[PDB]
Design a protein around this ligand. Structure first.
Ligand SMILES: CN(C)CCc1ccc(Nc2cnn(C)c(=O)c2Cl)cc1
Length: 120
């Protein structure tokens, strides 16, 4: 669609980056974001970094947003998706972390759709 191709191809502008920061800030304020605010502490999960190839967290994405690391929205969505995919890969489905990933990913999808709608 218009938004799917924009998402893949349209370079992110400074104006886009205001929208990206708003989305990230709203995730960081969400009640269910607590497991994802900061990198996974190895002492919470001793085998985590031997298993998870590309860790991700909201503080690392905040740094990348500040530095204009992302050229396309697809790259931003991929980093965010890693947070939730890593969590569901490593944890059982009845884990509170896994449940937080399900709730926060649905919230991110709601916010991401709003952001894509306003790029016009
Ligand atoms: C040092 N801490 C006890 C602080 C509390 C805390 C912070 C973040 C997490 N986040 C984790 C942890 N372990 N694993 C396997 C995960 O997947 C995730 Cl998302 C947990 C506790």
């Amino acid at each position: 669609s218009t938004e799917d191709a924009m998402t893949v191809l349209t370079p992110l502008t400074e104006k886009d980056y205001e929208g990206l920061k708003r989305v990230l800030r709203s995730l960081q304020a969400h009640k269910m974001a607590w497991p994802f605010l900061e990198p996974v502490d190895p002492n919470d999960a001793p085998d985590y970094y031997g298993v998870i190839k590309e860790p991700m967290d909201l503080a690392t994405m905040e740094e990348r947003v500040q530095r204009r690391y992302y050229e396309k929205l697809t790259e931003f969505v991929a980093d965010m998706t890693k947070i939730f995919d890593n969590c569901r890969y490593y944890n059982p489905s009845d884990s509170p972390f896994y449940q937080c990933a399900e709730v926060l990913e649905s919230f991110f999808v709601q916010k991401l759709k709003g952001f894509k709608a306003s790029r016009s």
